[PDB]
């Protein structure tokens, strides 16, 4: 509604303003009275599959697990590597940025001291042991799970992890009822999986879709991630040390170009008029 | 079974069995009568339909209704669905040694709950019977029942030490997560409402606006030990979902 | 002002004048039932309409018929009081007079051969009490009105159902009042389909052809014509200019001498304008443009008479050549358009497999009744019965009106039968909607929803009963006798009474009427529900039927509704809402004539509200001239905007008209969030009456209305002077101007003392008047259960402080005083009824006696020799109210107990103790016992003493009525002799007996004397007969359920005080639970020493957003300050003039308050009484949206010598030092809610067990255990406590030999576990095994 | 079944149409079937005949008087003792169900409100055990001959 409730509760409300607010009040109340039934159904469905998850071994001795990376993508970092790996167990001899500096013999409990040691270094990728990778038959092993969260020590055998998992992810169900690229901070403009090519102006342009814009700080870890589509134009090259507040990439959100990576004569080949193409000329430009 | 007012009550299975065996006897009579084939076919189809309704009423054809114009429930209707034996009688079960009361605020310690004295003698009643027999105060168990019915001073003098070091579970429906069930060490209060420690209200998602509380008393040594070791509110400090604490002052 | 208004005047802060007073609140029920009761010979409403709908009814052969003549309701045999006492429905017999007409086939018109006139009885019709409720089986019950989709035609649409295309699929819908339903639907391929009663879709040509419609005329009705001409060389086409709507010109359009649109070019409006200019109609067309068009008529050649091209066939070039050579220049073709006239009907004929009417009827029969072979006549009979039979189809007047209005027809009246024109018009309207002209209507619009009240469903059930009767009369007349058949013996009254009884009591819409408060009464009788027969269900209802539609404004309040799953399905109509003659809600309004707001009131429905613009009640009127501002806020078309003075057509009657009655009682509503206002209004209905009612200091002004409209108070019918009162009776000598010249003219008001409610609460009325004071018409006499001097008073009001106190109000908890407990501000009385039934078991009849085995005489001290507790005997939990003995069957004697019998020698006789005991934890006093006994069985001496007490009471009250009636009748009995001569020397001197023997005179006095003698003969013989009837009725045997001998009812009165645990709530959604009881010296006090008695959490205000409680607290402080000053100056008695001056100064405080109360007209005694009444604190009225601003509160606090800020410093009661910051303290109206703590207290160690599954029962009433649901099982197995789970699943509930030994070894002090197989698994095994599938256990 | 039983009983030589004779047998078959079957608790044909007569007579009384027929007043029409009328009215009980929705929603059937009145209370079992122990010890406190004679008696 365009007319706002200019009044407040200290000054009271008109009859019209009260009637308008009642719409939203009833909407919210009905949504609350309705969607938690679906939330309870979802919790029951979740707890049904995870009945048999009970820790059975301590170490299944499995191979490599899964990679771990922060959430730097999209915009600013939401959750860093500090809390995404707190309580996990590594799978390989993960090493510090200085070569041949190993802190774990393929498995250790990443309690607070190890998190501090890791964040002190410039490590950004750690491979930890996950439940999906566990090789235990008819259950999971304790080391493939990680330390318990209610206690803080390594989880002991016999504890039913599926039920607590389903309950924990079903509890908040009620509460959840409802062209250009600009750099923000100083860093290194890094292009990953880039098919680089030079435009007519001598700058750098892109000819692929599997390329991502990365912001690398002085330490080496990636801070910001951005998406660049195929056939975009970049105002800066690769490996450029620049500060934030600069529009580096420009592309038309509507026009999608077929830019040719090579240079040479362009003669019209295999376009015969009247069968596949039509003769149309611009009425203002003439080109 | 007979009812108090001289009436009767029965399951619909009696109706379905009567129907199927009536039609089976009629078919048996028809066979030896050398009846025309169309009538015998009609009777066989009627038997098929009757057995079909017995096994699953509203599955093949129209549901057979009783005298109240409601569909008769088959014996497959009462093992399936929300109201069946599996969900209503096997997974979730009515329980003994339990009570309910409104919830009020506590000065209380974190491991204690305020249990009304009027409820305590009822919940633990066999325990008072046994302890009072052991003390030799009443000759027989029926005498002890008389004493607990008179509420003499001795029954309270036995209660205050029966409850001590005997944890008691507290339940607040709906139990969204594992913290909805916790064990507290009872303390006896003159009143009618369950006194709850404010620090656990956040975990219970309970406010003092008329919410109820279900109370359960563990019986065996193993159950009391499990309540003391795993279910005590002192043990539950951090949520199982994630490491942050759950006893934050609200 | 009325006389009893002078005794307490509530200050009103309302600014805008009140134009229309609030209507009678129960009119919605009273008028609806009145229409069902009264006889309307010309009207069709109620019993007359129901009878004339069925009657006359004729036999199958037509040789006889029944003619309904008239009907009459007999006098109800039992009054409401004895109906409630004896547990019988309050009803009256239905007597109907009807006729018999007999026809004979020997004479072509032998109509008159035999006639039968008699009055036959059928059915019992429950009556409506004066208060607008019903009494069914001795229990108070009300029927709520239903809100259902109105009969008529509605059109709908689809939003993304077809994901493949995303098109919008419009559909039409015909829903009659009763009968089969008809639906018209579209398809993504743009074809028309029909559905009957939600069956499979069928092409629409089927229903067209079923009405004897050929293809030619169908196409003519649903399309236009294209003229085709051949001038022996080329094709001439007659062009309509308004047909080329911007399409592509396939060929080069030309004219007589000009060419306009080239090939493959668009046609812009300039070409059509030029075509209109030059007026050229005939244009030449090529063959290529012609192929692709469909013909509109069959064509044959007259040379041989064979078909050339059938209708609805797309012709081609060879077809054109054939038509040309056959000599057919005149050709007509359909007009197809992609934008305005789609070929939906043409496509439908393409999909149609049928060809003639018989095929269509056969297809309809096959669709409706699959499997049964079709028949030549059965198909047409079924089709006629679908929509063209009065008995099996009806649209009703409302349905016909809505149908015609949606069809844009001018007719209002019509027929309830469908016609071909009706279906054709509906289809044409749907096709127009699909094309784009017209708009699909809205389903939850209040113009499309109808209110069905109790009279309507009652008449519907009566129609069902008459249909049941006709089902048997049709055969009874056909097969029965022709001459000796009396109509009485051939009719049956069981079906009609059965149907009406099922509706009254076994239906969903009739439920027990809430009786906690008069407000609960009003808000339950003024209730609108969307459930029941023909309505939604909570599981089915979605969102559109729950949200607040913009048309609810002024008809249905948006604040008062349940918070559960049915939040949008149960509503309550607003204060001023009414009902059309059709059943549509409308709201009053004030007409505006050229900027002048005339006071005449108009009622507009929802459909008419959108046409005009309505100025809201926030506008200011400049002395019946114009408004204050040039631009005035209004609402139109469901939206709000700003309009000039002249545009305004209507004005809201009052600012109170949006909210309902229950939500209107909240003061300062406009300062409350809607969420909390909803819960406050809901909780307001759950208040419990207290020992003494306390007026709300901060009210709204409609308490005086709801209290007198509830009917719980004794209102004076006729004005007069009070002559004599008691605690039970009030008599008034009516003034001479209301004395009818025929009767005494003295009224009796018999109060109702402590009586059980439906919710076990006390009802009493106490006289609020004194001896010898004047009373007026419509004036209150006795206060109701929760009323104070005629004003509704749900709860009490006392000091309240907003401050956190040691955590005792941690989370919405309440801290309460010991002082409030001492003065019983919340003590409530509860009345319980306990029934002891004695039946005749086959082992022997049960007996009620004081002789009971193995019971000490101490427990029998409260029983008389007859075994019944004395009246007034205080009884605690566990005592024996009535001693009942049942014969004991043969009992097996084990070796040990028979050894004991041999040792001690006692023998148990044929006796078993089954006496009624007071349930545990209940203590009270027996206030009444009632004994009913079967006819034939001898009555016990207790029953005899009750009977003689009732006899003496009946005699005494009949005689007292005699004295009252005659004390006024003497004003005519004596005065007639006084007429024609006063004889005061000898008339008054002689006793009244010696008054008819006065001096003899002419025959006129002889006629007067004989008339008076006849009157005295009446008096003699009108009153011994009724005494005899009452005596016979009391001593008459009581009809009881078969198998019982006597029933003893015992009434228990429980006085319940406040405890930690009881639910306390305010009027703003701020509920709570009493946490602890605080000593009086333990709580905060101000410098004056007065301690606050309620302490509330300040933190509950901001997040909850209910600010109205702060304003109410400030008003309470101001009002109590005014009362304190008045009381302080009254204790000294300065001067009556000084009191008058101060009260007058306190009564004019607002800027432009409506009322101007002047005390100069009050006498000294009148002023002193008024000051005494408000000595406890002057009460203040605050309308919902015209309340006092903060400025008035500040002025009132200044008047009372109170701080402007509204907060003062308090000192802690424990340590005694001033708090750091000022704390707001005032008077707030608390409520005592029905959620007591002892009613929710429960605990169970070991008790009853269910029968089929051997598990403990549930519920406090049957001493059931708590339910350990599956979520808590999940929680335990998440903990890992396997042993607690094992005991919770085996030894707690379903181990028959497990729980017993667990009991035994717990008693022996050994808490050892012995598992077992649950019985609930054994029943599952036996059930699966009995289903035909093997199930076993693989043992080792 | 009745029609089959009537076909052979019928003879053309009687000079009557088949329907007249077949209607009697069909009515008898249907009435007997409703008599024996159609009730959870079977009632003999005699007593259901009597209850049908009571229903007809009560309808006839209610047609004229308009009030319920008094059992004392029913003896005049039935010409049989008023105790027989009460006995007849006794058995009119028809079983209802175990799943009648006693409450308002589909959550509380009548089967959940039915108590098992055939189980001894655990207190009674405990008393029996205590009594057994008391008797055992008190008999151990006697002479052997007396103890054995009391037990074996």
UniProtKB/Swiss-Prot annotation, chain B:
Modified how: Acetylated on several lysine residues in the presence of glucose.
Use in biotechnology or industry: Co-administration of salinamide and rifampicin or salinamide and myxopyronin suppresses the emergence of resistance to both antibiotics.
Binding site for Mg(2+): 207, 209, 211
Secretion signal, residue range per the UniProt entry: none
Domain of life: Bacteria
Subunit structure: The RNAP catalytic core consists of 2 alpha, 1 beta, 1 beta' and 1 omega subunit. When a sigma factor is associated with the core the holoenzyme is formed, which can initiate transcription. The rRNA transcription and antitermination complex (rrnTAC) consists of RNAP, NusA, NusB, NusE (rpsJ), NusG, SubB, ribosomal protein S4, DNA and precursor rRNA; S4 is more flexible than other subunits.
Known role: DNA-dependent RNA polymerase (RNAP) catalyzes the transcription of DNA into RNA using the four ribonucleoside triphosphates as substrates.
Family from the record: Belongs to the RNA polymerase beta' chain family.
Protein name, as recorded: DNA-directed RNA polymerase subunit beta'
Curated annotation (Swiss-Prot), chain C:
Catalyzed reactions: RNA(n) + a ribonucleoside 5'-triphosphate = RNA(n+1) + diphosphate
Post-translational modification comment from the UniProt entry: Acetylated on several lysine residues in the presence of glucose.
Practical applications according to UniProt: Co-administration of salinamide and rifampicin or salinamide and myxopyronin suppresses the emergence of resistance to both antibiotics.
Biological process (GO), any one: regulation of DNA-templated transcription initiation
Consequence the record notes for mutating residue 675 to H/K: Resistant to antibiotics salinamide A and B
InterPro entries to which the protein is assigned, alphabetical: DNA-dir_RNA_pol_bsu_ext_1_sf, DNA-dir_RNA_pol_bsu_external_1, DNA-dir_RNA_pol_su2, DNA-dir_RNAP_su2_dom, DNA-dir_RNAP_su2_hyb_sf, RNA_pol_bsu_bac, RNA_pol_bsu_CS, RNA_pol_bsu_protrusion
Residue numbers of N6-acetyllysine PTMs: 1020, 1198
Cellular-component GO terms for this entry: cytoplasm; cytosol; cytosolic DNA-directed RNA polymerase complex; membrane; transcription elongation factor complex
One Pfam family cited in the UniProt record for this chain: RNA_pol_Rpb2_6
Keywords, ordered alphabetically: Acetylation, Antibiotic resistance, DNA-directed RNA polymerase, Nucleotidyltransferase, Transcription, Transferase
EC number annotated for this UniProt entry: 2.7.7.6
One GO MF term: ribonucleoside binding
Assembly with partners or alone: The RNAP catalytic core consists of 2 alpha, 1 beta, 1 beta' and 1 omega subunit. When a sigma factor is associated with the core the holoenzyme is formed, which can initiate transcription. The rRNA transcription and antitermination complex (rrnTAC) consists of RNAP, NusA, NusB, NusE (rpsJ), NusG, SubB, ribosomal protein S4, DNA and precursor rRNA; S4 is more flexible than other subunits. In pull-down experiments interacts with CedA. (Microbial infection) Interacts (via flap domain) with Escherichia phage lambda antitermination protein Q; this interaction renders bacterial RNAP resistant to transcription pausing and allows it to read through termination signals.
Protein family: Belongs to the RNA polymerase beta chain family.
Name of this protein: DNA-directed RNA polymerase subunit beta
Organism field: Escherichia coli (strain K12)
From Swiss-Prot, chain D:
Locations listed in the record: Cytoplasm
Site (Interaction with anti-sigma factors): 153
Region described as Sigma-70 factor domain-3: spans on this chain: 49-125
Family, as annotated: Belongs to the sigma-70 factor family. RpoD/SigA subfamily.
Described purpose of this protein according to its UniProt entry: Sigma factors are initiation factors that promote the attachment of RNA polymerase to specific initiation sites and are then released. This sigma factor is the primary sigma factor during exponential growth. Preferentially transcribes genes associated with fast growth, such as ribosomal operons, other protein-synthesis related genes, rRNA- and tRNA-encoding genes and prfB.
Record text on subunit structure and interactions: Interacts transiently with the RNA polymerase catalytic core formed by RpoA, RpoB, RpoC and RpoZ (2 alpha, 1 beta, 1 beta' and 1 omega subunit) to form the RNA polymerase holoenzyme that can initiate transcription. Identified in a complex containing RpoD, the RNA polymerase subunits RpoA, RpoB and RpoZ, CRP and DNA. Interacts with Rsd; this prevents interaction with the RNA polymerase catalytic core and with promoter DNA, and as a consequence, promotes transcription from promoters that require alternative sigma factors.
Domains as described in the record: Contains 4 domains, connected by flexible linkers. In the active conformation, the domains are in an extended conformation, each making extensive interactions with the RNA polymerase catalytic core. In the autoinhibited state, sigma-70 factor domain-1 packs closely together with sigma-70 factor domains-2 and -4, contrary to the extended conformation that is seen when the protein is part of the RNA polymerase holoenzyme.
Protein name: RNA polymerase sigma factor RpoD
Originating organism: Escherichia coli (strain K12)
Range covered out of full length: 410 to 562 of 613
């Amino acid at each position: 509604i365009e007319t706002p409730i200019t009044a407040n509760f200290r000054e009271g409300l008109n009859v019209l303003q009260y009637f308008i607010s009642t719409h939203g009040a009833r909407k919210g109340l009905a949504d609350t009275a309705l969607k938690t039934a679906n939330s309870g159904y979802l919790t029951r469905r979740l707890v049904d599959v995870a009945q048999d998850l009970v820790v059975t071994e301590d170490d299944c001795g499995t191979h490599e697990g899964i990679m771990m990376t922060p959430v730097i993508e999209g915009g600013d970092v939401k959750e860093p590597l500090r809390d995404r790996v707190l309580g996990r167990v590594t799978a390989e001899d993960v090493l510090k940025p200085g070569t041949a500096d190993i802190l774990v013999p393929r498995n250790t409990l990443l309690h607070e001291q190890w998190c501090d040691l890791l964040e002190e270094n410039s490590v950004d990728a750690v491979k930890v042991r996950s439940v999906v990778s566990c090789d235990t038959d008819f259950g999971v092993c304790a080391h493939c799970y990680g330390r318990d969260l209610a206690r803080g020590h390594i989880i002991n055998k016999g504890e039913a992890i599926g039920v607590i998992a389903a309950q924990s992810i079903g509890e908040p169900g009620t509460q959840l009822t409802m062209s250009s690229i600009q750099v923000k901070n100083k860093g290194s403009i890094k292009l990953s999986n880039v098919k680089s090519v030079v435009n007519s102006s001598g700058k750098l342009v892109i000819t692929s879709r599997n390329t991502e814009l990365k912001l690398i700080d002085e330490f080496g870890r990636t801070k910001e991630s951005y998406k660049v589509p195929y056939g975009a134009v970049l105002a800066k090259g690769d490996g450029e040390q620049v500060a934030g507040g600069e529009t580096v990439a420009n592309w038309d959100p509507h026009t999608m170009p077929v830019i040719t990576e090579v240079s040479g004569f362009v003669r019209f080949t295999d376009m015969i008029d009247g069968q596949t193409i039509t003769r149309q000329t611009d009425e203002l430009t003439g080109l | 079974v007979p009812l108090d007012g001289g009436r009767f009550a029965t399951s619909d299975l009696n109706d379905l069995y009567r129907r199927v065996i009536n039609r089976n006897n009629r078919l048996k009579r028809l066979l030896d009568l050398a009846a025309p084939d169309i009538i015998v076919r009609n009777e066989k189809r009627m038997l098929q339909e009757a057995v079909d309704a017995l096994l699953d009423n509203g599955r093949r054809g129209r549901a057979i209704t009783g005298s109240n114009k409601r569909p008769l429930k088959s014996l497959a209707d009462m093992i399936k669905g929300k109201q069946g034996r599996f969900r209503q009688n096997l997974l979730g079960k009515r329980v003994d040694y339990s009570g309910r009361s409104v919830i009020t605020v506590g000065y209380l310690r974190l491991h204690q709950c305020g249990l009304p004295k009027k409820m305590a003698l009822e919940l633990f009643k066999p325990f008072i019977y046994g302890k009072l027999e052991l003390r030799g105060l009443a000759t027989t168990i029926k005498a002890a029942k008389k004493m607990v019915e008179r509420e003499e001073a001795v029954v309270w003098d036995i209660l205050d030490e029966v409850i001590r070091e005997h944890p008691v579970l507290l339940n607040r429906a709906p139990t969204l997560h594992r913290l909805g069930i916790q064990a507290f060490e009872p303390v006896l209060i003159e009143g009618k409402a369950i006194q709850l420690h404010p620090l656990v209200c956040a975990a219970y998602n309970a406010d003092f606006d008329g919410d109820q509380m279900a109370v359960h008393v563990p019986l065996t040594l193993e159950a009391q030990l499990e309540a003391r070791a795993l279910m005590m509110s002192t043990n539950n400090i951090l949520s199982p979902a994630n490491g942050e604490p759950i006893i934050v002052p609200s | 002002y009325s006389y009893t208004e002078k005794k307490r005047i509530r200050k009103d802060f309302g600014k805008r004048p009140q134009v229309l007073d609030v209507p009678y609140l129960l009119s919605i029920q009273l008028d609806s039932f009145q229409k069902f009761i009264e006889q309307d010979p010309e009207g069709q409403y109620g019993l007359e309409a129901a009878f004339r709908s069925v009657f006359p009814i004729q036999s199958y052969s037509g040789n006889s018929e029944l003619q309904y003549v008239s009907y009459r309701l007999g006098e109800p045999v039992f009054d409401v009081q004895e109906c409630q006492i004896r547990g019988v429905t309050y009803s009256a017999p239905l007597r109907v007079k009807l006729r018999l007409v007999i026809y004979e086939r020997e004479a072509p018109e032998g109509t008159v051969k035999d006639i039968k006139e008699q009055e036959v009885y059928m059915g019992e019709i429950p009556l409506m009490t004066d208060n607008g409720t019903f009494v069914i089986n001795g229990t108070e019950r009300v029927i709520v009105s239903q809100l259902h989709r109105s009969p008529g035609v509605f059109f709908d649409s689809d939003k993304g159902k077809t994901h493949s295309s995303g098109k919008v699929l419009y559909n039409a819908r015909i829903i009659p009042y009763r009968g089969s339903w008809l639906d018209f639907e579209f398809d993504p391929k743009d074809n028309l389909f029909v559905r009957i009663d939600r069956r499979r879709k069928l092409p629409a040509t089927i229903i067209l052809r079923a009405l004897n419609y050929t293809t030619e005329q169908i196409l003519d009705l649903f399309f236009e014509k294209v003229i085709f001409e051949i001038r022996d060389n080329k094709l001439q086409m007659e062009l309509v200019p308004e047909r080329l709507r911007g399409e592509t010109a396939s060929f080069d359009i030309e004219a007589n001498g000009k060419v306009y649109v080239e090939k493959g070019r668009r046609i812009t409006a300039r070409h059509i304008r030029q075509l209109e200019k030059d007026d050229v109609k005939l244009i030449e067309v090529p063959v290529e443009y012609i192929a692709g068009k469909v013909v509109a008529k069959d064509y044959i050649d007259e040379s041989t008479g064979e078909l050339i091209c059938a209708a609805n066939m797309e012709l081609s070039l060879d077809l054109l050549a054939k038509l040309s050579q056959s000599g057919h220049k005149r050709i007509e073709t359909l007009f197809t358009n992609d934008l305005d006239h789609g070929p939906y009907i043409s496509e439908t004929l393409r999909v149609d497999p049928t060809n003639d009417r018989l095929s269509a009827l056969v297809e309809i029969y096959r669709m409706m009744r699959p499997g049964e072979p079709p028949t030549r006549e059965a198909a047409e009979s079924l089709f006629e019965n679908l929509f063209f039979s009065e008995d099996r189809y009806d649209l009703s007047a409302v349905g016909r009106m809505k149908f015609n209005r949606s069809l844009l027809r001018e007719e209002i009246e019509g027929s309830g039968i469908l016609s071909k024109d009706d279906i054709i018009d509906v289809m044409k309207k749907l096709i127009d909607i699909r094309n784009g002209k017209g708009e699909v209507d809205d389903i939850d619009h209040l113009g499309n929803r109808r209110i069905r009240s109790v009279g309507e469903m009652a008449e519907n059930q009566f129609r069902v009963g008459l249909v049941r009767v006709e089902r048997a009369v049709k055969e009874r007349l056909s097969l029965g006798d022709l001459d000796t058949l009396m109509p009485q013996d051939m009719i049956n009254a069981k079906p009609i009474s059965a149907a009406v009884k099922e509706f009254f009591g076994s239906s969903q819409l009739s439920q027990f009427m809430v009786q906690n408060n008069p407000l609960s009464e009003i808000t339950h009788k003024r209730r609108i529900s969307a459930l029941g027969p023909g309505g939604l269900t909570r599981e089915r209802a979605g969102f559109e039927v729950r949200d607040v539609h913009p048309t609810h404004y002024g008809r249905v309040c948006p604040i008062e509704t349940p918070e559960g799953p049915n939040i949008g399905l149960i509503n309550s109509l607003s204060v001023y809402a009414q009902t059309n003659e059709y059943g549509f809600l409308e709201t009053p309004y004030r007409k505006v004539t050229d900027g002048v707001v005339t006071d005449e009131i108009h009622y507009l429905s929802a459909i008419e509200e959108g046409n005009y613009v309505i100025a809201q009640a926030n506008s200011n009127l400049d002395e019946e001239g114009h408004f204050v501002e040039d631009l005035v806020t209004c609402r139109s078309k469901g939206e709000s905007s700003l309009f000039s003075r002249d545009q305004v057509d209507y004005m809201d009657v009052s600012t109170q008209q949006v909210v309902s009655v229950g939500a209107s009682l909240i003061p300062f509503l406009e300062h409350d969030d809607a969420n909390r206002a909803l819960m406050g209004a809901n909780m307001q209905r759950q208040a419990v009456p207290t020992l003494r009612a306390d007026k709300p200091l901060v009210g709204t002004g409609m308490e005086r209305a709801v209290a007198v409209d509830s009917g719980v108070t004794a209102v004076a019918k006729r004005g007069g002077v009070v002559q004599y009162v008691d605690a039970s009776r009030i008599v008034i000598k009516v003034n001479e101007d209301e004395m009818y010249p025929g009767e005494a003219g003295i009224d009796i008001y018999n109060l109702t003392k402590y009586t059980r409610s439906n919710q076990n609460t006390c009802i009493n009325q106490m006289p609020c008047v004194s001896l010898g004071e004047p009373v007026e018409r419509g004036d209150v006499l006795a206060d109701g259960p929760s009323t104070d001097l005629g004003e509704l008073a749900l709860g009490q009001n006392m000091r309240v402080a907003f401050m956190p106190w040691n955590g005792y109000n941690f989370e919405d908890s309440i801290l309460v005083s010991e002082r409030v407990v001492q003065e019983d501000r919340f003590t409530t009385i509860h009345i319980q009824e306990l029934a002891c039934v004695s039946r005749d078991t086959k082992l022997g009849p049960e007996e009620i006696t004081a002789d009971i085995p193995n019971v000490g005489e101490a427990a029998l001290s409260k029983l008389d020799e007859s075994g019944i507790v004395y009246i007034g005997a205080e009884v605690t939990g566990g005592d024996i109210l009535v001693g009942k003995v049942t014969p004991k069957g043969e009992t097996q004697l084990t070796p040990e107990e028979k050894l004991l019998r041999a040792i001690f020698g006692e023998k148990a006789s044929d006796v078993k103790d089954s006496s009624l005991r007071v349930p545990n934890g209940v203590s009270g006093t027996v206030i009444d016992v009632q004994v009913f006994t079967r006819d034939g069985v001898e009555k016990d001496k207790r029953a005899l003493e009750i009977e003689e007490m009732q006899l003496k009471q009946a005699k005494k009250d009949l005689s007292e009525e005699l004295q009252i009636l005659e004390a006024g009748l003497f004003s005519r009995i004596r005065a007639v002799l006084v007429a024609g001569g006063v004889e005061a020397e000898k008339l008054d001197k002689l006793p009244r007996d010696r008054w008819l023997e006065l001096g003899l005179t002419d025959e006129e006095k002889q006629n007067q004397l004989e008339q008076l003698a006849e009157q005295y003969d009446e008096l003699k013989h009108e009153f011994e007969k009724k005494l005899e009837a009452k005596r016979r009725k009391i001593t008459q045997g009581d009809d009881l359920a078969p198998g019982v001998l006597k029933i003893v009812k015992v009434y228990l009165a429980v006085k319940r005080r406040i405890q930690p645990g009881d639910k306390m709530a305010g009027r703003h959604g701020n509920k709570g639970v009493i946490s602890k009881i605080n000593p009086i010296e333990d709580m905060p006090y101000d410098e004056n020493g007065t301690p606050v008695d309620i302490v509330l959490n300040p933190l509950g205000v901001p997040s909850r957003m209910n600010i109205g409680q702060i304003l109410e607290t400030h008003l309470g402080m101001a009002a109590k300050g005014i009362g304190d000053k008045i009381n302080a100056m009254l204790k000294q008695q300065q001067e009556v003039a000084k009191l008058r001056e101060f009260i007058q100064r306190a009564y004019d405080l607002g800027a432009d308050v409506r009322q101007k109360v002047d005390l100069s007209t009050f006498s000294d005694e009148e002023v002193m009484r008024l000051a005494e009444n408000l000595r406890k604190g002057m009460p203040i009225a605050t309308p919902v949206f015209d309340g006092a601003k903060e400025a008035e509160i500040k002025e009132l606090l200044k008047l009372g010598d109170l701080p402007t800020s509204g907060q003062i410093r308090l000192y802690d009661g424990r340590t005694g030092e001033q708090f750091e910051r000022p704390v707001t303290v005032g008077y707030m109206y608390m409520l005592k809610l029905n959620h007591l703590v002892d009613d929710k207290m429960h605990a169970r160690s070991t008790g009853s067990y269910s029968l089929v599954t051997q598990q403990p029962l549930g519920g406090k009433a049957q001493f059931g255990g708590q339910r350990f649901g599956e979520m808590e099982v999940w929680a335990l197995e998440a903990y890992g406590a396997a042993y607690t789970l094992q005991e919770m699943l085996t030894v707690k509930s379903d181990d028959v030999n497990g729980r017993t030994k667990m009991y035994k070894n717990i008693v022996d002090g050994n808490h050892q576990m012995e598992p077992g197989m649950p019985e609930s698994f054994n029943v599952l095994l036996k059930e699966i095994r009995s289903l035909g599938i093997n199930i076993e256990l693989e043992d080792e | 079944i009745g029609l089959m039983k009537a076909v052979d009983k019928f003879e053309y030589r009687r000079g009557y149409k088949f329907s007249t004779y077949a209607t009697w047998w069909i009515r008898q078959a249907i009435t007997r079937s409703i008599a024996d079957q159609a009730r959870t608790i079977r009632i003999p044909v005699h007593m259901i005949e009597t209850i049908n007569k009571l229903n007809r007579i009560s309808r006839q009384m209610l047609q004229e008087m308009g009030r319920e027929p008094t059992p004392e007043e029913l003896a005049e029409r039935m010409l049989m003792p008023e105790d027989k009328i009460r006995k007849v009215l006794k058995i009119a009980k028809e079983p209802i169900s175990m799943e009648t929705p006693i409450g308002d929603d589909e959550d509380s059937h009548l089967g959940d409100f039915i108590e098992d009145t055939t189980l001894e209370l655990p207190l009674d079992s405990a008393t029996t055990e205590s009594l057994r122990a008391a008797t055992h010890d008190v008999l151990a406190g006697l002479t052997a001959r007396e103890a054995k004679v009391l037990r074996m008696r």
